[PDB]
Amino acid sequence: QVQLVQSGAEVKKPGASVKVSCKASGYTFTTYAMHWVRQAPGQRLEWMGWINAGNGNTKYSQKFQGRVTITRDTSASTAYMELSSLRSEDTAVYYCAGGGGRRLQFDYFDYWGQGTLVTVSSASTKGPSVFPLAPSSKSTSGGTAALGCLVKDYFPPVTVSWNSGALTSGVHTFPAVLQSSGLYSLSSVVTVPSSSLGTQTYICNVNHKPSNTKVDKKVEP
Amino acid sequence: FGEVFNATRFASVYAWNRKRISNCVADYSVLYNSASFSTFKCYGVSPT
Amino acid sequence: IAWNSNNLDSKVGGNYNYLYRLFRKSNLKPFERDISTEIYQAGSTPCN
Amino acid sequence: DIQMTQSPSTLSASVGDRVTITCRASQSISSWLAWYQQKPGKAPKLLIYDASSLESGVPSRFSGSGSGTEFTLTISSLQPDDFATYYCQQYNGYPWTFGQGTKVEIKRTVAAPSVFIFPPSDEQLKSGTASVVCLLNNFYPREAKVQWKVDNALQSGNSQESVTEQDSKDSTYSLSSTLTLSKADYEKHKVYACEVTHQGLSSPVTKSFNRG
């Protein structure tokens, strides 16, 4: 079965350029059709261009004309993409597609790369600030209350857990949100029977690898 | 053919010059594969 | 039989699903398919 | 350029049922199209090409149809692996576009939310910006509404909404409303309230507190 794999995550800055690339593994290369397409988060997919993995042909888009380029290396059987004059919009996930096989060209994407994540930012690495989310006895709902562990003003998704896997029930971890300041923020929450409020110990567990920080905070009701 | 391709001073485009070349024995082998011509191409007649 | 058809085949801006050979060493014996693609060798400096 | 818009938008279903999707085109298409399945956080998988053909390795349930402009996908029985969006691709002309996204969700008696608010933490009060969290958990309808009422006034622009994705086991939805502001606004205000309007709820429900 043909498969496509490619590079990991990237982070860049405005005005720069980035080079993503995907390696092919196909039973024959009968004028193969590596063929790029991108997706801004929560948006319509957008199509880049197609390289003629047979020889050299380079039909490109039109919204992206004059600033993106594509090449490939025959011996390594990989496909090379290049974009310049980046800007905050092109924050997206980038995809390799193609691989007809029977006939030589199509225009439908039947073999998809597992995805490449590109973030166009102006900030830099920063640790996440942490605050507890204490409930009150005012809202004792069915003898159960909610509780969480906020994270604010950080940049490169945070792995969050409660008492290092000790708790699994009712856990909730919301997706991140961009702010005006250009920093990300997350809120994670969970509810427990209020009966065990004052007699148990809950501490969220956050791991931000791009800054290597590990923070724990006991929640005081 | 040898001297035109190796003439030392070529004219400018507007004053291009001709040669009523005739009654001779061409040989396009080396001219084809001199391995130095950045642009050989033509029409009407196949290169070979 | 032949009939005009671009209303089905000419994707606007350009179709590229249709390819045809241009250079081959031999003229083609009737009724054979020669799918495989390689590179052509002309005179000296043969290219593979 | 060719425009591609899908009229259905989001849809609803339950296991073992049939669904239909419409993909309309601004111009005429000569049955050039394909249908992609995309689970969350994965890569697209192709299902149908040339608007009719069934590509190998897929369940036989899927089936295309249609020609000209209005195009249709349809599945007989609804298996679990059908729970994701679906896109339509045109390839009649140049720059090839895509649809909007058509998601399907399991449908069941509406579950009403449980509302929660959190006052800002005093450690956050040391920093210099104020954060307020209004929470909604396990409410099956997604098109809900939350508004903030501070000192008996509505508040706009400074609020952000983040909504979870529906859980397989839970099959419900959960939401957080965050209100952020600078300290100078904080003590200037005495009472804080977030209000939520929900289909399952009999009446709009207000939850609130004041400082201390």
- The token pair that represents D211 in the structure block: 């400082």
Question: In angstroms, rounded to a whole number, what is the distance separating the alpha carbons of residues D89 and D194?
Answer: 42
Does D91 reach chain C within 8 Å, measured CB to CB? yes
Report CB contact under 8 Å: C13, D92: no
Question: In angstroms, rounded to a whole number, what is the distance separating the alpha carbons of residues A70 and A207?
Answer: 36
Give Cβ neighbours of residue D58 (< 8 Å, ≥ 6 apart). D47
Does B46 reach chain C within 8 Å, measured CB to CB? no
| CA closest to D29 among chain C residues | C8
Backbone CA torsion sign across A73, A76, A79, A84: negative
User: Which residue spans within chain A are E strands per DSSP?
Assistant: 3-6, 10-12, 17-25, 35-39, 45-51, 58-60, 68-73, 78-84, 92-98, 111-112, 116-120, 129-133, 144-154, 159-162, 172-173, 177-178, 184-193, 203-208, 213-218
**Does chain A reach chain D with at least 3 CB pairs under 8 Å?**
yes
Report CB contact under 8 Å: C45, B35: yes
Pick the closest to residue A154 from A117, A116, A205, A207 (CA basis).
A207
> Which among C7, C8, C11 has CB closest to D93?
C11
Q: Which method, experimentally, gave rise to this model?
A: cryo-EM
| CA closest to C19 among chain A residues | A104
SS (H, E, C) chain C: CCCCCCCCCCCECCCCCCCCCCCCCCCCCCCCCCCCCCCCCCCCCCCC
User: In a 3-state reduction of DSSP, which class is residue A20?
Assistant: strand
The Cα diameter of chain B in Å comes to: 31
The answer to whether A31 touches A105, Cβ cutoff 8 Å, is: yes
Question: In angstroms, rounded to a whole number, what is the distance separating the alpha carbons of residues D66 and D93?
Answer: 18
- The token pair that represents A190 in the structure block: 């969970």
Pick the closest to residue A97 from A32, A9, A28, A30 (CA basis).
A32
| CA closest to A61 among chain C residues | C13
For chain D, state the CA radius of gyration: 23
Determine the straight-line distance between the first and last CA of chain B, rounded to whole angstroms.
18
Question: In angstroms, rounded to a whole number, what is the distance separating the alpha carbons of residues A73 and A78?
Answer: 6
User: In a 3-state reduction of DSSP, which class is residue A128?
Assistant: coil
The answer to whether D97 touches D82, Cβ cutoff 8 Å, is: no
Give Cβ neighbours of residue D159 (< 8 Å, ≥ 6 apart). D146, D148, D177, D178, D179, D180
Residue D46, strand partner residues: D36
- The token pair that represents A204 in the structure block: 């969220």
Question: In angstroms, rounded to a whole number, what is the distance separating the alpha carbons of residues A19 and D56?
Answer: 33
User: Which residue spans within D57-187 are E strands per DSSP?
Assistant: 63-66, 71-75, 85-90, 104-106, 114-118, 129-137, 145-150, 154-155, 159-163, 175-182
Does A58 reach chain C within 8 Å, measured CB to CB? no
Q: What is the per-residue DSSP string for chain B?
A: -HHHHT-S-PPPSTT-------SS---HHHHHS-S--S----SSS---
Phi-psi category of D183—alpha, beta or left, where left has phi over 0 and alpha has psi -120 to 50?
A: alpha
The residue of D2, D28, D30, D91 whose CB has the most chain C CBs within 10 angstroms, and thus the best one to mutate to test that interface, is: D30
- Dihedral (Cα; D107, D112, D113, D115), 10-degree rounding: 170
Report CB contact under 8 Å: D92, C8: no
| Residue with tokens 């909504």, as numbered in its chain | D163
Question: In angstroms, rounded to a whole number, what is the distance separating the alpha carbons of residues D210 and A29?
Answer: 69
Question: In angstroms, rounded to a whole number, what is the distance separating the alpha carbons of residues C11 and D33?
Answer: 13
Q: Within its chain, how far is the Cα of C30 from the centroid?
A: 16
To one decimal place, what's the resolution in Å? 3.7
> Which among D30, D32, D93 has CB closest to C13?
D93
Does C44 reach chain B within 8 Å, measured CB to CB? yes
**Does chain D reach chain B with at least 3 CB pairs under 8 Å?**
no
- Subunits with 3+ C-beta pairs closer than 8 A to B: C
Give Cβ neighbours of residue C20 (< 8 Å, ≥ 6 apart). none
All residues of chain C having their beta carbon less than 8 Å from the beta carbon of residue D32 are 11
Pick the closest to residue A117 from A16, A17, A24, A11 (CA basis).
A11
Give Cβ neighbours of residue A50 (< 8 Å, ≥ 6 apart). A33, A34, A35, A36, A59, A98, A107
Side-by-side strand order, sheet with D19-25:
D4-5, D19-25, D71-75, D63-66
Q: Identity (one letter) of the amino acid at B22?
A: S
Does D49 reach chain C within 8 Å, measured CB to CB? no
Does A57 reach chain C within 8 Å, measured CB to CB? yes
- The token pair that represents D131 in the structure block: 């954060």
The answer to whether A4 touches A111, Cβ cutoff 8 Å, is: yes
The Cα diameter of chain A in Å comes to: 71
Give Cβ neighbours of residue A209 (< 8 Å, ≥ 6 apart). A159
The answer to whether D33 touches D90, Cβ cutoff 8 Å, is: yes
Helices (H), D7-135: 122-127
Distance from CA of D123 to the nearest CA of A (A): 7
Q: Measured at the alpha carbon of residue D165, what is the angle toward residues D159 and D168, in degrees to the nearest 5?
A: 155
Question: In angstroms, rounded to a whole number, what is the distance separating the alpha carbons of residues A34 and B9?
Answer: 49
Which run of H or E residues covers position D78? none
Report CB contact under 8 Å: A104, C19: yes
Interrupted after residues, chain A (C–N over 2.5 Å): 156
The DSSP call for residue A139 is G
Question: In angstroms, rounded to a whole number, what is the distance separating the alpha carbons of residues A26 and A35?
Answer: 15
The residue of C37, C38, C40, C48 whose CB has the most chain A CBs within 10 angstroms, and thus the best one to mutate to test that interface, is: C37
The answer to whether D145 touches D197, Cβ cutoff 8 Å, is: yes
A29, B39, C47 from C23: Cα distances, Å: 20, 19, 13
Give per-residue burial for A26-63: e unless 16+ CB within 10 Å, then b: beeebbbbbbbbbbeeeeebbbbbbbbbbeeeeebbee
List all residues of chain C from 15 to 44 with a beta carbon under 8 Å from chain D: none
